[PDB]
Structure formats: structure tokens, C-alpha cells
Amino acid sequence: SSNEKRHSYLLKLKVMYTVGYSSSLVMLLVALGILCAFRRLHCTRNYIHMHLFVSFILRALSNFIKDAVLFSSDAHRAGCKLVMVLFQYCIMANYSWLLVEGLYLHTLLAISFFSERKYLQGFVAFGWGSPAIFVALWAIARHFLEDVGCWDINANASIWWIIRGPVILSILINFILFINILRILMRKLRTQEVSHYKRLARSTLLLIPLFGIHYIVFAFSPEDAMEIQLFFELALGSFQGLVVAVLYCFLNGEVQLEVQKKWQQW
């Protein structure tokens, strides 16, 4: 009779993160369109924003595809395994592009004298090709060491660690960079006082969504709170893209001015 608790819980989680990824997909599509349809915004930061937006869209689409293939009503083994590989790659790519955006802002504020366009090549290569290496190694280890049905059940920890270690490292490194960036910004505000704290808090709350800082909460967490862990991330980290998009496309000054131009003077 048990496990109906967890089954209904996971089904409601599915409803809510489907809503979340749907809203984030819509807003990220709007935001990518606005960022690409204006040439004055073609910065090096807006370029990385576009890549991050693409990673978020891929994450949402891949969740939809995985759901429709797996949890919607022995052949098709290859198609199912390739859907799972695509799924893992899209997730890991979203995490890698959160890390790449943290690394970009940190190297922009911690060196600030560097060739940005020569750094852009390595940044895009890393963001789109570190996921590939780990997901390919995981798929190889599954085809060899644990090949049961679709590769949708993580029953061997090591094979799962191969693709969960990189994500935990992404979260931890990006949190360290977040702290160092806020240290730099506090020095900027202090060196050259209640409004100082207000501005620092605003720049913390605007920098949380773009770095994936809400993942450090439940990183290194036991299986005991797993449910709420899932809930939090899946019920709110599925809206992350949305809020990210919104801020970094809808509450920006440059974007608002550029779109106001074509809207008002037609």
C-alpha cells in the first residue's frame, strides 16, 4: 500500500515543473528573440546570455521529450537510450553554462585586462563540450557496466557519480566565484552606510538566479530531505530560467531602450 505517497508526490511535482519549464521556455524564447533581433545589444556579455538562454531552452525541451518518451503510456532500446543521453547532456550543459557565466563575470572583475574575444572561444567550447565528454563517458559506462532497459534508473552510484560529480563541482566553483564577486563589489561600494548594504543585497538577489546559487542549498544533502530537495529545485529551479530571462532581458536598461526605439518610432 505504501509508495503511493511518493508516487502522488512525484506526479504533482511533475505537473508543477512542467508548468515551470513551460513558462521558462516561453520567456527564454522571447528573450533570445529580443537579444538576437537587435544588433546594438551584441555585446560579449549578451552573447553569453544568449548561450545560457539556449542551454535553458534545451533543458526544458529535453525534460518534455524525456517525459513524453518515458512516463507516457523491448524494442526502441536504442531510441530510449539516446533520449536519455540527450537528456543528461542538456541538463549538464545548463549547469556548465551557469558555471561559464560565473567564470566570465569573475574573470571580467578579477583580471579586467584581457582579450575578451579570444576568451570567448574557450568559454563557448568549454560550455558546450564539457557536458559532452562526461555524458559520453556516462553513456559508455552504462552500455558496458550497467545496461538495463532504458537508462532511466540510477541504481549504481559510481556510474551516477560520473555525471553528478561535475555538476556538484560546477555548483561549488560558481558559489566561490559568487562570493569573490560580491567581495569585489563590496570593496567598490565601500572604498571609493545603509544604502551600501541595500545595493549589496540587491546585487546579491540579482546575481543568485544567473549563477545557479540556489543549488548550493541542497548540494551535499542527505536522502532524508530528498523529496523537498526535488520540490524546491524542481518546483522553483524550473522557473529559474524564467526569472533569469526576465531580469537579464526585461529589467535591463540597454534592452529596454533598444526595444523602445523600434516600438515607438516604428
Binding site: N3, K66, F71, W160, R164, V167
Partner: peptide, 27 residues
């Protein structure tokens, strides 16, 4: 990550549920 954990958990649970339904049908 969390999408993978949700997928593993839901897959395992509905697998157990199908097995349980088979056990009812067969016994």
C-alpha cells in the same frame, strides 16, 4: 542532479507498481 533523481525515482516507483499489479493479476 535533480532532474535525474526525479526520473530515477519515478521510474523505479512505477516499475514497482507495474510489478505489483502483475503480482495481483497472477497470484
Amino acid at each position: 542532479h535533480s532532474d535525474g533523481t526525479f526520473t530515477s525515482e519515478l521510474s523505479r516507483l512505477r516499475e514497482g507498481a507495474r510489478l505489483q499489479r502483475l503480482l495481483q493479476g497472477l497470484v
